[PDB]
Amino acid sequence: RIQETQAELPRGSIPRSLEVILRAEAVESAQAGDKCDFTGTLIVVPDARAETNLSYRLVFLACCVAPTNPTAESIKNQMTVKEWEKVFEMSQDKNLYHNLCTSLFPTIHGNDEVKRGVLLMLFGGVPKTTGEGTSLRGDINVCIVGDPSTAKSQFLKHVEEFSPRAVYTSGKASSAAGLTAAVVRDEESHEFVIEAGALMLADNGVCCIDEFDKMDVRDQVAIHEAMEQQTISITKAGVKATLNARTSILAAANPISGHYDRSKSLKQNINLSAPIMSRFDLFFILVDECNEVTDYAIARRIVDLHSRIEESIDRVYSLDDIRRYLLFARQFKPKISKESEDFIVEQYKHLRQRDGSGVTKSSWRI
Amino acid sequence: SVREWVSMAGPRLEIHHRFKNFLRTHVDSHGHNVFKERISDMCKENRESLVVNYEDLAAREHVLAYFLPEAPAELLQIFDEAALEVVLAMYPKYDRITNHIHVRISHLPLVEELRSLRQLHLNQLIRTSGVVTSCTGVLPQLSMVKYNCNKCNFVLGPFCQSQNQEVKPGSCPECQSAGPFEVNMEETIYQNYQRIRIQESPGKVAAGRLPRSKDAILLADLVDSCKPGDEIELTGIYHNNYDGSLNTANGFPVFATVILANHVAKDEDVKMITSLSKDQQIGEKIFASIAPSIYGHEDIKRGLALALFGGEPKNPGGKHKVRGDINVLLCGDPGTAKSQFLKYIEKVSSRAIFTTGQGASAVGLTAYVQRHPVSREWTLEAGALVLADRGVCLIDEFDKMNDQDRTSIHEAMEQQSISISKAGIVTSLQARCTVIAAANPIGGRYDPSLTFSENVDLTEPIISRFDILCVVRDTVDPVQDEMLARFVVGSHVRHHPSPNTYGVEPLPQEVLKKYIIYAKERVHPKLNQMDQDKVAKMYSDLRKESMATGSIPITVRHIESMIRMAEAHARIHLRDYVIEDDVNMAIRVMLESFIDTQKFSVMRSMRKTFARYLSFRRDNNELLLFILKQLVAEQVTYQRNRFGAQQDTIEVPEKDLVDKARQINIHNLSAFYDSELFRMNKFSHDLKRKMILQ
Amino acid sequence: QLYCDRYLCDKVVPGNRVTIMGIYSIKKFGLTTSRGRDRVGVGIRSSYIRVLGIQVDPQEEEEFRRLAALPNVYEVISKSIAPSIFGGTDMKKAIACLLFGGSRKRLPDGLTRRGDINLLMLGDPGTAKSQLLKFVEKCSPIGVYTSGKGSSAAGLTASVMRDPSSRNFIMEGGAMVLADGGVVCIDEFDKMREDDRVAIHEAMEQQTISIAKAGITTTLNSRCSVLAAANS
DNA sequence: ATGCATGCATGCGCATGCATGC
DNA sequence: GCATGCATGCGCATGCATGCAT
């Protein structure tokens, strides 16, 4: 089943659905959640009357399926000479840490910490398994809280536009059945098929949730279960199944009173349960300062963007190159050196010592 | 085709003779007749199945191995006939016991996964691996059906029951009628039938795609060989030739595929236990064995060991019932690894049920009657408490429960039974189980200034049920934090894809399980040698001084708990009678648990007053280390408060430690300086200045 | 699935633990083509068991008369009530006379007067109150033990519903309703819910419970002695 | 004579309205 | 002042039983 894209939607119209049939080797491709171009014919299948001296429907047959916009050794072999040259040029630059920050967020002024956190979340870690049967998380989740209009929702949209596999939800617009998955019958056999939810479509990707406080308690419990076990279990309609959801969550939230209280802790400012709160790796807090120079700087950028629609951007690397580099880099599984162990131990000791009573109270314990 | 050549009688007889010769003459690498001993072992258990390795068959006769994948049914029938003939030649009585024998292939060249099964594999032999998701149970299917005529009483001859089409008898030979017929239940032969749904392993599924499932059928001895949720490997036949497989009523002409499987792949101990019990440090080894991956928390491990070993229920007549289960409650700050203990206990325990009070638990905590979503049958599903009868029930997030769960737990802990009155069903079910629960404080951090009851959302009657209460705090100790960080980093490094305790040696898990089973089965301690006077005096003094303090007096209940713990200790050493050591240990544990729940001033006063009982089998070095830690903490706090930052070195005079030791009646500290604990905490002693440096 | 014939009907109430001896058979209803979505099963007949046997898991009058004719029956009965618990002789006597109970009397006017006794106990924890309740529940011929808020899967008072499929008035037996002429022990008297608290007033006073819903009005009988425990 | 459309539960998914508890 | 627990209507699909039009 295929769906009409958003770019072709006319005024006040809902996207149309079409049915495609694949034969022989073309059966292998065309996985769910993809954006693909199909080549084939339009053929009528029965679903006025005839007599001796009529209900029909439209079905599409496809011949080839291709990506709309197109194992380290295999990736190296697939890439062309110029693509590999560009990848090598990118790899040998320190400014890659800085330039990418300007590459993905050109219009946004300041907030470099959020950009670096988003980059680290995008790159992700290395998952591991223990000998006792337990599993260790390798994904990174990021939460943002701030005053109104402090560029809070722009990062989620940028991740939407950049990431190829990303699903975005807001508040109560997504139901419980919208997430997780659903099970329905097969139309031509005794088998059953599974309709994937938002989390499953964003598998090995990034899931963006705005207005995280408005979500219902049951939905938050389901999200916490997905974050913790990284598995979705469905026992419905005579079907029992378990599915893998290895996603990374980027969430946006607002204070209870609508403004961040400087004299209160983080727990007293957000109406979020402690379990889901503890699972997040990084929390970012944005406060709108009443500074004249900051207002001038923001105004300059906004007016420059509005004055020059497309000439106010000086990206160093195209988004396609960044996507290719990310795809190449995510395959690597670096190890931990011996001296890094002692360095991490000492740094964690210092971080714990920071929690002493000789300094003012912090908003989040370690 | 291969099947066409196989069908005719000539090659059938030739293959039969060849397989008989192969069965008779096959030997192992050492020359021993494999089939002789295999058939003898099968005979010893009156089995009905035989296992044949494909590698040996290919090595001996290549033609049978070549024809095997492309013609499974007929060749398997021929092999069954040959095996039956050979077995009947070996033993003649089996015509009375078993009239047929099945031949199953064990090994095969590994075949593609469930995704690659396509048209090329039609009517062939395949090997797959998957995970079981459902089971239909055992069902009876017809075989050699005998029919009874409706007009006359003639019994029709047996008809072979094919799995492709239903049996349709032609007509009665005598009366020549062709009307309806009925099945002769008394003389018909029946076979076992089972159906399974198999899904790909989630770990091997590539990202961006969903696992796929297929159906399989088991017959005869293969039934009830796989539990749901287990990982299996099957060798089977990829089949379509069954009636109703083709979609004809509407839609495209689509066939449904079904796999027919024929193979599934998944005294001295007593003396050893008695010898281990003779060891002088068996109890310490058992205590250190629990939770190898969890650092510290020795008291928690000891309490969990006592709970696991358990006690002995009593019932004088049928009036006064006293339980013997030791319930455990842990309350702690976040990040103290409370869930790891529960997971380890679930792994160790033979019958353990794990549940969480937050919600969406796999196993519920309240009984209800409902139609099961999978089996679609009207069932009565009891709570985790009933399913854990004579077992262990672990509860996580104990403070997030609702009213129904709280009421059910209260009635299961007080009355040890659950009463159900729903949908016209009135039942009472036993819930004899040991409860271990984990919880967090109300404010997110434990406050020593308040009592244990005020720091937990639970009510006093619920807390009163638990025999052992543990309190875990997250105080900042640099050495402990450094050691924990080292352990965590080492654990992370070791498990990349590409001995610290005073105990001599922890026991292996299997030996621990055998010890627990033996102790539970064959140990029943008796209290014929108890000393009532000491217990009575201690109880009187405890009550008097608790009321002198004026907060939370002790009661009779604790004494009973103490007795239980004593019995538990007597179960560890396999002693048939309790002695003074177990009584003293139980007294120490109970007093520690009671004291830890009081507030600051009361706890300090009780600890000062009751130093005699709490020091049973303790180490003076540990007490001196505690004193030194208190002094160091005081000095560091003063330095941080005044100077505003920590200094590079910490120093403390020896005279204060000596004076405090004299207060505890200790006059020598050379052993403490030479003790391993002194070096472990990186303390040094300087006689040139009579100081202690850290 | 089980089939009972003739005199074997109504011998078993649902919820009982039974041992049944019978014949393992299959249903015979001629032949029919396989129908429905799934047609993999071929030649499968539903099975059942035909039940043939079910087991459920004057001289004494003189003995009782001799026991009651003694001058020391009161002391013997008092001692027989929980000999394990130390002290509380007056409490044991009160429990015994509660177990024996009084007599109910009707009047020509149609009014009724209660013949059952109700007791209340208050005290500090650790005074062995629950043990007495359990002993009373075991000793009494009919006895129910509750926790005030109902139970794991049964409420304290009855409820009435209407089945949409069959349009019949289904009543769920509560803890008070399940006992008639027996003793109901109630721990944690403080934590009672509002509706149950309101209903127990009428249950104690008139020994009846009146329930009115759409198209129905009923008055169930609850002649229960009440033994309650509570905390300070 | 045979295969199919329909009557009668029942699960599924959902939205909507009334009561209450913090 | 609002989110949630507890009925109840709405719309639907699915399964089991049977009764006869082509």
Ligand SMILES: Nc1ncnc2c1ncn2[C@@H]1O[C@H](COP(=O)(O)OP(=O)(O)OP(=O)(O)O)[C@@H](O)[C@H]1O
């Ligand atoms: N003593 C310890 N030794 C090893 N690892 C530890 C120890 N204490 C804590 N950890 C680690 O702390 C991490 C926190 O997760 P864990 O599930 O154990 O927390 P928890 O105490 O159950 O917390 P919560 O209060 O959130 O339920 C785990 O990965 C665990 O390995």
Ligand SMILES: Nc1ncnc2c1ncn2[C@@H]1O[C@H](COP(=O)(O)OP(=O)(O)O)[C@@H](O)[C@H]1O
């Ligand atoms: N630091 C900033 N730099 C540039 N533009 C900003 C910045 N902060 C806010 N803006 C502008 O203000 C608007 C904020 O809207 P939005 O991000 O939706 O607010 P919120 O996400 O908090 O609801 C954006 O359109 C953005 O262009």
Ligand SMILES: Nc1ncnc2c1ncn2[C@@H]1O[C@H](COP(=O)(O)OP(=O)(O)O)[C@@H](O)[C@H]1O
């Ligand atoms: N007077 C007594 N004689 C014998 N045992 C007692 C006495 N008082 C208390 N106990 C013991 O102490 C325990 C008290 O617990 P419990 O009766 O549940 O307290 P409560 O009912 O007040 O909550 C019982 O198990 C009982 O065996």
Ligand SMILES: [Mg+2]
């Ligand atoms: Mg926004």
Ligand SMILES: [Mg+2]
């Ligand atoms: Mg936990």
Ligand SMILES: [Mg+2]
């Ligand atoms: Mg009690």
Ligand SMILES: [Zn+2]
């Ligand atoms: Zn006949």
